[PDB]
């Protein structure tokens, strides 16, 4: 009974105190803790009783009092808020990969399905079977994790007075640059390797596929095999899931054709041929171009022109302008990225249509979002990741400050306006329209002779006076941004090459007039839906804005999954790892926002020996608190007094401790 | 918030308009205003007092066609307003009072032209912002370079602008009042030698079409003339609107020759090659080598077949043999000014260079002289 | 503990920087700061307000080049700070706050120059220690001698320092404000006789390159002039950056002749040979014989072909025939000051001669007058 | 016996010729040669292939005018011979084979120019004697002084020559290739801002007349510009040859401002005031006080109203307040070089300084380098 559940009730909340309480809870096999209404879950790498109907009925409704912390408390709290406000709510499960967000989402899905409908569980069966497809199409091996989700899964459970209707799955913040570029010791998405490993032989002969080491889009990492993963078994399980999800053989064949077309398009090279006034890129071998055309049922000459030419087309003429080698490379990569994005969108749309709902009056949203990323070598993808995490931390801080204001109002006090410095300056530093870092990057992507060095110089010039922005001393190609989780250094090496994602109308027109129905349908839908977003950063910002716009019509609930040890040892813990996880998860932002509360009895009973010898007053209250206050000659503006709590402790705590130790120095 | 800027490259002969960020102009039409010159006899037919653009060329045979711009200077300020109104409303189908507008102008025009464009934009069309750019800088923007000398040639003027690493040398800027319109007039004059008479303004358009379709630049003039005189293999036929067929021989390459020999039309100026060489030689000795290899050609008058070959030959003859001469003539150089303006107007850093309505209200029409260039 | 000292031989024309113990300077670049003098027209191009070193010569044709040092005196104290910052951070890639720095200065400079260098080193760059040395002593250190008279000639000043067995005679120290920069100016002046006009500061660099590549010292001036006038076998060609070819004849040896006849540039001073002889004759009669055979030449201006032969001839003509005259001109005399500074800064016994930060804090910037020399 | 010498001050723009001992030049006419550029259709009209001087300006509208001299260097040696023949025969009506001739030249010209003038005088016109003088020395001769610094400015070059008690300091002689012709070109360029187009060489003369009649030098540039912008009291009208009337405002004082700010025409050089101060500071410290009070201005470009006041103001700002600054601008300074040459050529002691025909025959054209200056 030494541990505590809610750290909000504590009188002195410091990083050391939070770490000590968390490790005390973890040593007693108590995983879940409370920060106000914010849950914290440490992954134990061990099977724990986080299930069972008896837990469901124990947490059913408001009959428990939330004395023990659990995810079922978050679930039934969201349900109660929905039934009270007649409005939707969302639960945001953040944290690093492998920290336990996935099974947290599955347990939430099971709990809601058990407590809402309790008559039919077909919705949860239909939405669980789509998980392997999304995991295969949206995860990749990084230098920090062997299976990391590179996107944000948005599952929306629709409810009608306790009746579970169909669910809608959505994707957000997908990493577009991983399809064509991978760093050292990391791979592409798992789907390509699974396809190349577990495909039947005659399919491979029909698609002219080979081992993954030959392809340029996969061999960049240098380690195409994961030690501890079986690609064939996962690929067969994916086939089983598609068969369960109604995907016929023709649809699977079309998907494999599209993926093989992307892989073959990744293997096209160009040569610098000499023209009368320029250098023109020409395809080395036409075998790959013809293979892509055959797999996609498009014209080979049309594809070669869409790769090696630029079209300026007005009403009365159409001019073809030859491209350079770099421009052709960018065009090919943009085509590959748009093909992959359209395929993923089609898969998710079909999955949603399979379990399509009927009405739309109430809904519960579950977001499985990746968290802060601070590696050794740090680049554009992690910059976008940290920008998204900053925008989520904005809402996290808003919720924390709302809880602080509610605590201040609930106590019988004259509620003052509490100061609070949000992380808006970081968001403005990264993506403000005039001179934001991403805006400078977008401008440099069309400027005549821009390179990475010029972009770095522009950033240094425009943000040299920003307190959050920091320059290296020596002329190193990097810059440092002071995030909420600390200083992060970004290495500008291929920022311009990773941002070129422009697809012109000629490519869309070529792909619409295909001899296969699915590709033509996808590109017709894309053309109908399509916009001044010609770069990866602009599309990422638009997607993040859409995600945020989907998430102000509700009061979010946050679940922060942590990691006790990088070796996945069930029980071993480290203090530095806990500090790093607390910094990255934004838990310490609550401590930063707090700066300080103490019951009136505690200091009266403690510091009674500072003014008098032994002042044991029999009647306690606010009057004796004020007496002990101005007997110490302290200005009333630096502290506040109420009934018992909310006694501000900015600097009086230090001087009180100093006076206490001075008094105790003699005896 | 997301107010897309408008790029309007109103030249002497063509209007090139569109939205910033696009790859091509949305509206391209002749910069003419026509008025009836005959007698209307049917009741209700003849209620239109003006035709602008393509509708002025559909009715070409009953109208008097007039150009509001000669040699890059707007001389008729009501026809220009009509053309701008047409561009904004009937062509782009956009409301100008909610879109910043980017306009272009020749480097060495009178200041009253720029001030009047600013006043018309801010008082008649009520645009929220404005900027006036130089066409050669936009040509470099479209060409993807920061160093080079640009030879822009529309149909009003021909000018040279040498730029090095984004720095312009204003003292080396040249200007010629010899361009496509003078070529059309000279072709009209020399077509009378075979008995073809084109007099009215409606036949000027036919002569312009003949010049666009058949004329070319000869690599060397004297041997080309000797070949044309000694045979008949250089003759081509053209069909007039009413079915008559005309034939032209040496007039095919004699018309564009006035770009290199302005003496044909009675001008004392030097050819475009000598003008470019003189502009290069007015720059620093450390800039000349880079400029020699970055000769960027822009405009519709540079679209003649074989013009780049002769420009390279002439510059090589003039410049020392040590230097390397390159003539950059992209296939889309007819729209390079508009493409560069579209690239420039879409930049996020450019949003601080607009002339806002408040600045105009504070400083009068003279703000454009210090805000632009 | 193992804090390697920095040796910075910042001359009037070149900066020679490196680490103590090395055999050659790590960074050698011109001591110039350039600023744009033209109009920037492209958005984003023109955000740099200064260019230092080699990047100031890459952009030579749009910049105004200025030297922070004339005749060994720092006249611009902000450009000098820019140059030192460049040297420490962009060139050597080292943090100055953890490396002792050794600097050089001409023997007879104003004291404010040395005090200001001390203040800048100890307050702006926060070096832990400092020393200011005399360039001729470092030349002797590099030459491996303790006795000899040094004729150092960079492009700011020319000075003579006679040293015997490690003891300097300060009363015999000479100084001339005639060096490479004056030679460049005189060559620029006399190149106008053939019609070549070099005016701007960017053409000063071209003239300097011409002087370095083609100029030489004649053994005897009058017969050399007679030979050059009576034939054309002494003429050489030079190619300008834009391809033009210039030819120079007697200007090849007339330019370095002003070192022995300062009257060509309107100075009343004596030649370098007479200055060296006068400096020798101001020493003790028992020192002269050893000095006559230890004439050490240092600096870039001493790199002309045939300069040592003429110096020996002139000194032999002046000195008595009994003495033996030796002119020591090592092939690496362009870096002798830096080599000597590197040798001196790496000595273990020298660690007690640094000006530490504590001594500066105690005694102000005037500590350098008693700690150094 | 009594063979009167001829003084020919052939400048870049004007020829000033006459007889020694006279008080004014006998013949003054432009130094131009014109050739027809149109087609002659009448029989017998068009038999003249060249027009020199005033007859080239009477026929200005059908001729191409060319100058044989730019920046004080004769670039066309046949047009120069035509001009000299005109001067000797049609203007002075004298036979050159019996009169010594005195010619002038800029201080820092190429030697080939002087040698070629000597050869032409001694071989084509068969003069009995010859001398080539420096124009600033003749300006001092005309001013009646032996000590002073001369700022001569024609329309080719601007040079400074400091002379003290009849002794010249050649190392302090300055030279600028910025003069009246560049002012005419800059005025032609800036006249396009009001819509006035002057292109041909015949309109260059009209622009030159406008510059001579209306342009002036402002005492201070910024407040003058503010006054011109805030009112319309500084505008004057000019009538063109065909009756059209033009009006110019701030262009009246913006044109001569390039003498003090050469950056307007894209030159890195310093103004005439800073050039004069630099030339003074290159002289001995005991000469500067006398030079400060003897600033002699000569040439046609120094004829602007208010130029002397601004020169005095600028020199006073530059020079120490202790010194007394005097600018000597005689009303006849447009002919001071010729007056000084006439005074010098009439001296009896000067008869021993001529280059006789025998000396030329003995020593070739190179005698002029040792006989003159
Ligand atoms: N293919 C062509 N060949 C020759 N001349 C052309 C061609 N295309 C256009 N032109 C000429 O160029 C002129 C228009 O070019 P443009 O650059 O649009 O002028 P502006 O910019 O002044 O409107 C017209 O006179 C037209 O006749
Ligand atoms: N090979 C050479 N021949 C003639 N002059 C040279 C040569 N090398 C360098 N110089 C001249 O010497 C001067 C630079 O010498 P340096 O000793 O580096 O000067 P400082 O020490 O004052 O910087 C320059 O003016 C340069 O022109
Ligand atoms: N009153 C004047 N005001 C301004 N400029 C003048 C005046 N008189 C002559 N000039 C200019 O001076 C130049 C001619 O002066 P001059 O000394 O005769 O030249 P040069 O000696 O080189 O022939 C011409 O360019 C002319 O325009
Ligand atoms: Mg145009
Ligand atoms: Mg030196
Ligand atoms: Mg003169």
mmCIF file of N, CA, C and O in Angstrom, chain B residues 137 140-141 145-146 163-171 281 284-289 292 320 322-323 344 347 349-350 353 373, chain C residues 36-48 51 58-63 198 200 202-203 206 239-244:
data_model
loop_
_atom_site.group_PDB
_atom_site.id
_atom_site.type_symbol
_atom_site.label_atom_id
_atom_site.label_comp_id
_atom_site.label_asym_id
_atom_site.label_seq_id
_atom_site.Cartn_x
_atom_site.Cartn_y
_atom_site.Cartn_z
ATOM 1 N N UNK B 137 14.140 38.171 -66.185
ATOM 2 C CA UNK B 137 14.319 37.470 -64.916
ATOM 3 C C UNK B 137 13.393 36.267 -64.845
ATOM 4 O O UNK B 137 13.782 35.186 -64.384
ATOM 5 N N UNK B 140 14.813 33.487 -66.945
ATOM 6 C CA UNK B 140 15.816 32.725 -66.201
ATOM 7 C C UNK B 140 15.172 31.814 -65.164
ATOM 8 O O UNK B 140 15.626 30.683 -64.960
ATOM 9 N N UNK B 141 14.128 32.294 -64.485
ATOM 10 C CA UNK B 141 13.432 31.452 -63.516
ATOM 11 C C UNK B 141 12.877 30.200 -64.181
ATOM 12 O O UNK B 141 12.993 29.094 -63.640
ATOM 13 N N UNK B 145 18.051 28.592 -64.079
ATOM 14 C CA UNK B 145 19.408 29.102 -63.966
ATOM 15 C C UNK B 145 19.396 30.377 -63.140
ATOM 16 O O UNK B 145 18.366 31.041 -62.999
ATOM 17 N N UNK B 146 20.557 30.708 -62.583
ATOM 18 C CA UNK B 146 20.763 31.985 -61.923
ATOM 19 C C UNK B 146 21.777 32.866 -62.633
ATOM 20 O O UNK B 146 21.879 34.051 -62.299
ATOM 21 N N UNK B 163 22.577 38.567 -66.341
ATOM 22 C CA UNK B 163 22.429 38.321 -64.912
ATOM 23 C C UNK B 163 23.457 37.281 -64.492
ATOM 24 O O UNK B 163 23.638 36.272 -65.182
ATOM 25 N N UNK B 164 24.137 37.532 -63.376
ATOM 26 C CA UNK B 164 25.171 36.644 -62.862
ATOM 27 C C UNK B 164 24.894 36.347 -61.397
ATOM 28 O O UNK B 164 24.924 37.259 -60.565
ATOM 29 N N UNK B 165 24.637 35.075 -61.087
ATOM 30 C CA UNK B 165 24.387 34.620 -59.717
ATOM 31 C C UNK B 165 23.256 35.408 -59.065
ATOM 32 O O UNK B 165 23.292 35.717 -57.872
ATOM 33 N N UNK B 166 22.235 35.730 -59.853
ATOM 34 C CA UNK B 166 21.103 36.472 -59.343
ATOM 35 C C UNK B 166 21.302 37.966 -59.242
ATOM 36 O O UNK B 166 20.431 38.651 -58.696
ATOM 37 N N UNK B 167 22.415 38.491 -59.741
ATOM 38 C CA UNK B 167 22.692 39.919 -59.726
ATOM 39 C C UNK B 167 22.642 40.454 -61.148
ATOM 40 O O UNK B 167 23.345 39.949 -62.029
ATOM 41 N N UNK B 168 21.819 41.472 -61.366
ATOM 42 C CA UNK B 168 21.673 42.076 -62.680
ATOM 43 C C UNK B 168 22.615 43.261 -62.834
ATOM 44 O O UNK B 168 22.914 43.973 -61.873
ATOM 45 N N UNK B 169 23.084 43.464 -64.066
ATOM 46 C CA UNK B 169 23.937 44.593 -64.418
ATOM 47 C C UNK B 169 23.108 45.570 -65.241
ATOM 48 O O UNK B 169 23.045 45.453 -66.474
ATOM 49 N N UNK B 170 22.445 46.543 -64.611
ATOM 50 C CA UNK B 170 21.521 47.410 -65.360
ATOM 51 C C UNK B 170 22.188 48.242 -66.436
ATOM 52 O O UNK B 170 21.512 48.631 -67.397
ATOM 53 N N UNK B 171 23.483 48.534 -66.317
ATOM 54 C CA UNK B 171 24.142 49.359 -67.319
ATOM 55 C C UNK B 171 24.393 48.607 -68.617
ATOM 56 O O UNK B 171 24.676 49.242 -69.638
ATOM 57 N N UNK B 281 30.091 42.359 -73.550
ATOM 58 C CA UNK B 281 31.348 43.076 -73.370
ATOM 59 C C UNK B 281 31.222 44.260 -72.420
ATOM 60 O O UNK B 281 32.246 44.824 -72.020
ATOM 61 N N UNK B 284 31.640 42.636 -66.449
ATOM 62 C CA UNK B 284 32.976 42.434 -65.908
ATOM 63 C C UNK B 284 33.694 41.316 -66.655
ATOM 64 O O UNK B 284 33.072 40.393 -67.184
ATOM 65 N N UNK B 285 35.024 41.411 -66.695
ATOM 66 C CA UNK B 285 35.818 40.437 -67.436
ATOM 67 C C UNK B 285 35.709 39.054 -66.810
ATOM 68 O O UNK B 285 35.912 38.038 -67.486
ATOM 69 N N UNK B 286 35.382 38.982 -65.521
ATOM 70 C CA UNK B 286 35.218 37.704 -64.845
ATOM 71 C C UNK B 286 33.827 37.113 -65.024
ATOM 72 O O UNK B 286 33.600 35.969 -64.621
ATOM 73 N N UNK B 287 32.901 37.862 -65.619
ATOM 74 C CA UNK B 287 31.548 37.378 -65.863
ATOM 75 C C UNK B 287 31.375 36.855 -67.285
ATOM 76 O O UNK B 287 30.464 36.050 -67.529
ATOM 77 N N UNK B 288 32.241 37.257 -68.217
ATOM 78 C CA UNK B 288 31.986 37.026 -69.637
ATOM 79 C C UNK B 288 32.002 35.544 -69.990
ATOM 80 O O UNK B 288 31.206 35.096 -70.821
ATOM 81 N N UNK B 289 32.905 34.769 -69.383
ATOM 82 C CA UNK B 289 33.013 33.357 -69.743
ATOM 83 C C UNK B 289 31.742 32.596 -69.393
ATOM 84 O O UNK B 289 31.284 31.748 -70.169
ATOM 85 N N UNK B 292 28.916 33.644 -71.845
ATOM 86 C CA UNK B 292 29.063 33.121 -73.199
ATOM 87 C C UNK B 292 28.413 31.752 -73.352
ATOM 88 O O UNK B 292 27.968 31.395 -74.448
ATOM 89 N N UNK B 320 36.048 35.420 -78.944
ATOM 90 C CA UNK B 320 37.305 34.695 -79.160
ATOM 91 C C UNK B 320 37.083 33.192 -79.244
ATOM 92 O O UNK B 320 36.152 32.644 -78.653
ATOM 93 N N UNK B 322 38.694 30.847 -77.937
ATOM 94 C CA UNK B 322 38.933 30.106 -76.702
ATOM 95 C C UNK B 322 37.627 29.809 -75.971
ATOM 96 O O UNK B 322 37.451 28.714 -75.424
ATOM 97 N N UNK B 323 36.702 30.763 -75.958
ATOM 98 C CA UNK B 323 35.461 30.600 -75.215
ATOM 99 C C UNK B 323 34.549 29.574 -75.878
ATOM 100 O O UNK B 323 34.653 29.286 -77.072
ATOM 101 N N UNK B 344 7.695 32.170 -59.725
ATOM 102 C CA UNK B 344 8.035 33.209 -58.760
ATOM 103 C C UNK B 344 6.847 33.567 -57.874
ATOM 104 O O UNK B 344 7.011 33.794 -56.673
ATOM 105 N N UNK B 347 6.114 31.192 -54.741
ATOM 106 C CA UNK B 347 7.063 31.042 -53.648
ATOM 107 C C UNK B 347 6.496 31.630 -52.361
ATOM 108 O O UNK B 347 5.805 32.652 -52.374
ATOM 109 N N UNK B 349 8.415 32.761 -49.852
ATOM 110 C CA UNK B 349 9.226 33.918 -49.498
ATOM 111 C C UNK B 349 8.842 35.159 -50.291
ATOM 112 O O UNK B 349 9.147 36.276 -49.860
ATOM 113 N N UNK B 350 8.184 34.987 -51.436
ATOM 114 C CA UNK B 350 7.759 36.109 -52.262
ATOM 115 C C UNK B 350 6.557 36.849 -51.692
ATOM 116 O O UNK B 350 6.259 37.955 -52.149
ATOM 117 N N UNK B 353 6.932 40.549 -50.855
ATOM 118 C CA UNK B 353 7.327 41.495 -51.890
ATOM 119 C C UNK B 353 6.141 42.063 -52.656
ATOM 120 O O UNK B 353 6.335 42.876 -53.564
ATOM 121 N N UNK B 373 11.846 46.196 -58.618
ATOM 122 C CA UNK B 373 13.184 46.452 -59.146
ATOM 123 C C UNK B 373 13.898 47.538 -58.343
ATOM 124 O O UNK B 373 14.458 47.271 -57.279
ATOM 125 N N UNK C 36 28.900 42.757 -52.433
ATOM 126 C CA UNK C 36 28.264 42.970 -53.737
ATOM 127 C C UNK C 36 28.162 44.450 -54.080
ATOM 128 O O UNK C 36 27.919 45.291 -53.214
ATOM 129 N N UNK C 37 28.346 44.757 -55.363
ATOM 130 C CA UNK C 37 28.252 46.126 -55.853
ATOM 131 C C UNK C 37 27.195 46.287 -56.936
ATOM 132 O O UNK C 37 27.093 47.367 -57.529
ATOM 133 N N UNK C 38 26.407 45.254 -57.207
ATOM 134 C CA UNK C 38 25.378 45.282 -58.235
ATOM 135 C C UNK C 38 24.009 45.053 -57.596
ATOM 136 O O UNK C 38 23.873 44.998 -56.373
ATOM 137 N N UNK C 39 22.991 44.916 -58.440
ATOM 138 C CA UNK C 39 21.604 44.837 -58.004
ATOM 139 C C UNK C 39 21.120 43.393 -58.060
ATOM 140 O O UNK C 39 21.193 42.753 -59.114
ATOM 141 N N UNK C 40 20.614 42.892 -56.935
ATOM 142 C CA UNK C 40 20.071 41.550 -56.875
ATOM 143 C C UNK C 40 18.620 41.492 -57.299
ATOM 144 O O UNK C 40 17.773 42.171 -56.714
ATOM 145 N N UNK C 41 18.314 40.685 -58.315
ATOM 146 C CA UNK C 41 16.978 40.655 -58.899
ATOM 147 C C UNK C 41 16.235 39.355 -58.641
ATOM 148 O O UNK C 41 14.997 39.343 -58.742
ATOM 149 N N UNK C 42 16.927 38.269 -58.319
ATOM 150 C CA UNK C 42 16.269 37.003 -58.030
ATOM 151 C C UNK C 42 15.967 36.876 -56.545
ATOM 152 O O UNK C 42 16.769 37.267 -55.693
ATOM 153 N N UNK C 43 14.798 36.324 -56.240
ATOM 154 C CA UNK C 43 14.339 36.215 -54.859
ATOM 155 C C UNK C 43 15.115 35.104 -54.165
ATOM 156 O O UNK C 43 15.101 33.951 -54.607
ATOM 157 N N UNK C 44 15.787 35.450 -53.067
ATOM 158 C CA UNK C 44 16.614 34.522 -52.335
ATOM 159 C C UNK C 44 18.078 34.536 -52.717
ATOM 160 O O UNK C 44 18.905 34.012 -51.964
ATOM 161 N N UNK C 45 18.425 35.124 -53.860
ATOM 162 C CA UNK C 45 19.809 35.212 -54.319
ATOM 163 C C UNK C 45 20.309 36.617 -53.999
ATOM 164 O O UNK C 45 19.901 37.600 -54.619
ATOM 165 N N UNK C 46 21.209 36.704 -53.024
ATOM 166 C CA UNK C 46 21.688 37.988 -52.558
ATOM 167 C C UNK C 46 21.482 38.186 -51.072
ATOM 168 O O UNK C 46 21.395 39.319 -50.591
ATOM 169 N N UNK C 47 21.398 37.083 -50.334
ATOM 170 C CA UNK C 47 21.236 37.116 -48.888
ATOM 171 C C UNK C 47 22.563 37.127 -48.148
ATOM 172 O O UNK C 47 22.569 37.228 -46.916
ATOM 173 N N UNK C 48 23.681 37.025 -48.860
ATOM 174 C CA UNK C 48 25.007 37.050 -48.261
ATOM 175 C C UNK C 48 25.603 38.438 -48.448
ATOM 176 O O UNK C 48 25.678 38.939 -49.575
ATOM 177 N N UNK C 51 31.911 38.120 -48.435
ATOM 178 C CA UNK C 51 32.634 36.936 -48.871
ATOM 179 C C UNK C 51 34.084 37.083 -48.445
ATOM 180 O O UNK C 51 34.696 38.128 -48.680
ATOM 181 N N UNK C 58 36.029 33.603 -56.084
ATOM 182 C CA UNK C 58 35.122 32.915 -56.996
ATOM 183 C C UNK C 58 34.059 33.866 -57.529
ATOM 184 O O UNK C 58 33.723 33.828 -58.718
ATOM 185 N N UNK C 59 33.522 34.728 -56.662
ATOM 186 C CA UNK C 59 32.536 35.733 -57.035
ATOM 187 C C UNK C 59 33.176 37.072 -57.377
ATOM 188 O O UNK C 59 32.554 38.121 -57.181
ATOM 189 N N UNK C 60 34.405 37.052 -57.895
ATOM 190 C CA UNK C 60 35.206 38.267 -58.016
ATOM 191 C C UNK C 60 34.536 39.324 -58.882
ATOM 192 O O UNK C 60 34.733 40.522 -58.658
ATOM 193 N N UNK C 61 33.742 38.911 -59.864
ATOM 194 C CA UNK C 61 33.199 39.831 -60.840
ATOM 195 C C UNK C 61 31.950 40.581 -60.446
ATOM 196 O O UNK C 61 31.416 41.326 -61.268
ATOM 197 N N UNK C 62 31.450 40.411 -59.226
ATOM 198 C CA UNK C 62 30.269 41.145 -58.790
ATOM 199 C C UNK C 62 30.542 41.805 -57.447
ATOM 200 O O UNK C 62 29.682 42.501 -56.899
ATOM 201 N N UNK C 63 31.737 41.594 -56.911
ATOM 202 C CA UNK C 63 32.092 42.066 -55.585
ATOM 203 C C UNK C 63 33.075 43.226 -55.669
ATOM 204 O O UNK C 63 33.752 43.428 -56.681
ATOM 205 N N UNK C 198 43.380 47.959 -66.819
ATOM 206 C CA UNK C 198 42.882 47.233 -65.657
ATOM 207 C C UNK C 198 42.585 48.268 -64.581
ATOM 208 O O UNK C 198 43.502 48.928 -64.082
ATOM 209 N N UNK C 200 39.326 48.070 -62.107
ATOM 210 C CA UNK C 200 38.603 47.656 -60.916
ATOM 211 C C UNK C 200 39.496 46.825 -59.997
ATOM 212 O O UNK C 200 40.617 46.447 -60.340
ATOM 213 N N UNK C 202 38.798 43.843 -59.096
ATOM 214 C CA UNK C 202 38.810 42.474 -59.595
ATOM 215 C C UNK C 202 39.889 42.269 -60.645
ATOM 216 O O UNK C 202 40.389 41.152 -60.805
ATOM 217 N N UNK C 203 40.254 43.321 -61.378
ATOM 218 C CA UNK C 203 41.356 43.240 -62.327
ATOM 219 C C UNK C 203 42.713 43.379 -61.653
ATOM 220 O O UNK C 203 43.731 43.011 -62.249
ATOM 221 N N UNK C 206 43.932 39.913 -61.450
ATOM 222 C CA UNK C 206 44.469 39.443 -62.724
ATOM 223 C C UNK C 206 45.875 39.985 -62.944
ATOM 224 O O UNK C 206 46.775 39.263 -63.391
ATOM 225 N N UNK C 239 46.744 34.789 -71.161
ATOM 226 C CA UNK C 239 45.343 34.672 -71.540
ATOM 227 C C UNK C 239 44.468 35.204 -70.413
ATOM 228 O O UNK C 239 44.550 34.720 -69.279
ATOM 229 N N UNK C 240 43.636 36.186 -70.731
ATOM 230 C CA UNK C 240 42.721 36.783 -69.777
ATOM 231 C C UNK C 240 41.532 35.858 -69.529
ATOM 232 O O UNK C 240 41.294 34.925 -70.299
ATOM 233 N N UNK C 241 40.783 36.079 -68.444
ATOM 234 C CA UNK C 241 39.668 35.166 -68.130
ATOM 235 C C UNK C 241 38.633 35.035 -69.235
ATOM 236 O O UNK C 241 38.026 33.966 -69.365
ATOM 237 N N UNK C 242 38.407 36.074 -70.032
ATOM 238 C CA UNK C 242 37.403 36.021 -71.087
ATOM 239 C C UNK C 242 37.967 35.592 -72.434
ATOM 240 O O UNK C 242 37.235 35.606 -73.426
ATOM 241 N N UNK C 243 39.244 35.221 -72.500
ATOM 242 C CA UNK C 243 39.833 34.695 -73.711
ATOM 243 C C UNK C 243 40.775 35.630 -74.438
ATOM 244 O O UNK C 243 41.513 35.170 -75.316
ATOM 245 N N UNK C 244 40.776 36.919 -74.107
ATOM 246 C CA UNK C 244 41.690 37.846 -74.758
ATOM 247 C C UNK C 244 43.127 37.558 -74.344
ATOM 248 O O UNK C 244 43.406 37.173 -73.207
#
